Amino acid sequence: KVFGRCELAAAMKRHGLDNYRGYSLGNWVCAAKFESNFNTQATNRNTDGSTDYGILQINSRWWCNDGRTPGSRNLCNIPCSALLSSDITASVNCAKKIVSDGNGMNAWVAWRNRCKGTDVQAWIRGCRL
Numbered sequence: 562k563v564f565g566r567c568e569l570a571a572a573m574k575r576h577g578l579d580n581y582r583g584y585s586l587g588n589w590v591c592a593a594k595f596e597s598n599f600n601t602q603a604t605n606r607n608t609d610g611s612t613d614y615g616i617l618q619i620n621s622r623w624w625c626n627d628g629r630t631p632g633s634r635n636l637c638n639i640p641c642s643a644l645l646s647s648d649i650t651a652s653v654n655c656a657k658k659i660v661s662d663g664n665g666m667n668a669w670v671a672w673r674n675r676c677k678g679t680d681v682q683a684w685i686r687g688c689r690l
């Protein structure tokens with residue numbers, strides 16, 4: 562599924578991502594935009610053989626099991642495939658663990674490089690909420 566901006570914002574809010582660990586909803590929408598362009602089915606292989614999955618490009622090295630990332634963990638306790646669902650519940654639950662791990666949203670390199678410090682409220686500008 563390819564979400565629209567406000568549609569994604571609303572879903573993230575429903576699953577309690579709004580101001581989770583102090584990160585406003587716009588930060589999460591901005592990260593989703595540059596991580597996956599709002600496409601739940603997005604996958605990308607990393608140089609190290611891990612793969613990133615879904616709307617927030619969660620990495621098989623640490624957070625999900627895809628069965629082809631030797632030495633990797635599965636800290637969200639889920640198959641990576643679940644992170645590609647039209648329903649974002651699994652990706653949000655896992656994102657909550659990731660942003661809590663110590664470095665906040667810097668865990669998402671595209672958030673650091675393209676969202677941190679910017680006017681992220683623009684991402685939720687106009688959304689009925």
Ligand SMILES: [Au+3]
Nearest residue numbers: 582664665666
């Ligand atoms: Au923080």
Ligand SMILES: [Au+]
Nearest residue numbers: 572648649650
């Ligand atoms: Au949802």
Ligand SMILES: [Cl-]
Nearest residue numbers: 575576577650
């Ligand atoms: Cl939920």
Ligand SMILES: [Cl-]
Nearest residue numbers: 572647648649
């Ligand atoms: Cl959803």
